Amino acid sequence: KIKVIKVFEAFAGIGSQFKALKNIARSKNWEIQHSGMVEWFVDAIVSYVAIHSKNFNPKIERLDRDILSISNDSKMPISEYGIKKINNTIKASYLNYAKKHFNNLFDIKKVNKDNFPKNIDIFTYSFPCQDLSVQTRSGLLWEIERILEEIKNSFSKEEMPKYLLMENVKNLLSHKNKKNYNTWLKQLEKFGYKSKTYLLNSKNFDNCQNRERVFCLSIRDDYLEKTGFKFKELEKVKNPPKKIKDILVDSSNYKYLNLNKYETTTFRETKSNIISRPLKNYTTFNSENYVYNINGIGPTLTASGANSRIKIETQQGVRYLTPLECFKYMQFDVNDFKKVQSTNLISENKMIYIAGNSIPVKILEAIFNTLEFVNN
DNA sequence: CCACATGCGCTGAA
DNA sequence: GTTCAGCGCATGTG
Ligand SMILES: C[S@@+](CC[C@H](N)C(=O)[O-])C[C@H]1O[C@@H](n2cnc3c(N)ncnc32)[C@H](O)[C@@H]1O
Ligand code: NA
Structure with missing residues (x-):
C-alpha cells in the first residue's frame, strides 16, 4: 500500500x-x-x-x-x-x-x-x-x-x-x-x-x-x-494565528542593540497583523528602521539586507532574530539547524541567507x- | 495629488 | 575574489 x-x-x-x-x-x-x-x-x-x-x-x-x-x-x-x-x-x-x-x-x-x-x-x-x-x-x-x-x-x-x-x-x-x-x-x-x-x-x-x-x-x-x-x-x-514569541529561543548571552540615540513611538498594528515601531534618524532605508513586537507576526525574511536583520523587542532588550530562530521562522526544525551548524562550514550570515x-x-x-x- | 504598507535586494569600500 | 553596512523606491491599495 x-x-x-x-x-x-x-x-x-x-x-x-x-x-x-x-x-x-x-x-x-x-x-x-x-x-x-x-x-x-x-x-x-x-x-x-x-x-x-x-x-x-x-x-x-x-x-x-x-x-x-x-x-x-x-x-x-x-x-x-x-x-x-x-x-x-x-x-x-x-x-x-x-x-x-x-x-x-x-x-x-x-x-x-x-x-x-x-x-x-x-x-x-x-x-x-x-x-x-x-x-x-x-x-x-x-x-x-x-x-x-x-x-x-x-x-x-x-x-x-x-x-x-x-x-x-x-x-x-x-x-x-x-x-x-x-x-x-x-x-x-x-x-x-x-x-x-x-x-x-x-x-x-x-x-x-x-x-x-x-x-x-x-x-x-x-x-x-x-x-x-x-x-x-x-x-x-486560515489557520490559527502564531506569534513571534512562540518560536523564540531563551538565552543568557544574546547581543542587544544600543538604540539609545534614536527617538521612537508607540507600536502600531497594521491590517497584516505586523506590530512595529519606527526608529527615527536611524537610517534612510525604510525597511531597516523598524522594531517588531513579539506578540504579532514579523516581516518576510529575506536572504540579505534589512529584512535579514529582523529587530525584535524583548524584556532583555532589542536584538536580531538569530540564525536558529530564522530556521524556525521558515518552519525548519531545531535539529535541521543544528545539522547545518555542525558542518562548521556555514557562517551565521550564510545560514540566514539560505533560510531567507x-x-x-x-x-x-x-x-x-x-x-x-x-x-x- | 495624498497616506499608508511592504519587500526570497543590491553593491562598493575595505 | 569576499563581505556586509549602508542605502530607496517599486508597486501597489484606499
Ligand atoms: C530562492 S532559492 C530556492 C530555495 C529553495 N526553494 C529551498 O527550498 O530552500 C533559488 C535557488 O536557485 C539556485 N540557482 C540559481 N541559479 C542556478 C543554476 N544555474 N543552477 C542551479 N541552481 C541555481 C540558487 O543557488 C538558490 O539556492
Ligand atoms: Na585544494
Whole structure:
C-alpha cells in the first residue's frame, strides 16, 4: 500500500520541498525518494546534505572532475581557482555526496532528456520574473521549457512528471509580469498540464511571518483523468494565528542593540497583523528602521539586507532574530539547524541567507497534502 | 495629488 | 575574489 514518491527539486536550496514531503509522508502512507535535484550554490548544497542525509560521514576528498558549474555566492560561477580551493577538503565530500546520493545535476543548463529522470512524481521549480521576457522565454525558465520540450519528445506521456510546483515572489502577478506569466501557463498547457495559481501567505499556515508567495501547481492531464484529482481552494485557508514569541529561543548571552540615540513611538498594528515601531534618524532605508513586537507576526525574511536583520523587542532588550530562530521562522526544525551548524562550514550570515531563500515548510505541506496518486 | 504598507535586494569600500 | 553596512523606491491599495 505504500506509495513511493519520486521528487525532483530544481533550484533546490536547502530542500524545503523535500522537508515538507518527509513531514507528511507517514500520514499519506508515502515513501519519499530523491529522483534528483539541481542546485549550484555551494553553501546550499552543503546544508541540504547536512539536513537530508542519513549516515553521511564527511571526510577530505578530491572534488569529482565533472563538478564544474558551482557558485560560492549563488549568483556567479566559481573560477578554476576557487574549484581548486574546494578540491581536497571536507567541503568537497558534501558536493560529491550530493552528486552521487541525491543525483544533483548542479546547473539547469546541464539538464537534458539524457539525464532527466523518467517517472517523476513531483517536479519543483522557480524562476526570476525577468525570464518571462526576451532579455518567448529567457534564462532559467527557458532552460526549464527546453527540458520539458526535450522530454516531451523522448519520453512517453506516462514518463513525464505527474505534478509540477512553481514557487515565486508576489511580484510575479504584477501589472508588468501577469500577462507573460499567463503565457507560461499556456505553454504548460501545450506540454499537457492543467494548472492553478495560488497566492498564499505563510501567516495563514501556522507561521508567525508575513510572507506572500505565488505557487503554480500543475497536474499532467491524463493523470488528472486517472486520479479524479480536483484542485483545492487553498487561498481560503486560515489557520490559527502564531506569534513571534512562540518560536523564540531563551538565552543568557544574546547581543542587544544600543538604540539609545534614536527617538521612537508607540507600536502600531497594521491590517497584516505586523506590530512595529519606527526608529527615527536611524537610517534612510525604510525597511531597516523598524522594531517588531513579539506578540504579532514579523516581516518576510529575506536572504540579505534589512529584512535579514529582523529587530525584535524583548524584556532583555532589542536584538536580531538569530540564525536558529530564522530556521524556525521558515518552519525548519531545531535539529535541521543544528545539522547545518555542525558542518562548521556555514557562517551565521550564510545560514540566514539560505533560510531567507527557502519556502515556509508548512505552506508546502498544505499544497502537497492535496496531491492524489494511483495505487498502481 | 495624498497616506499608508511592504519587500526570497543590491553593491562598493575595505 | 569576499563581505556586509549602508542605502530607496517599486508597486501597489484606499
Ligand atoms: C530562492 S532559492 C530556492 C530555495 C529553495 N526553494 C529551498 O527550498 O530552500 C533559488 C535557488 O536557485 C539556485 N540557482 C540559481 N541559479 C542556478 C543554476 N544555474 N543552477 C542551479 N541552481 C541555481 C540558487 O543557488 C538558490 O539556492
Ligand atoms: Na585544494
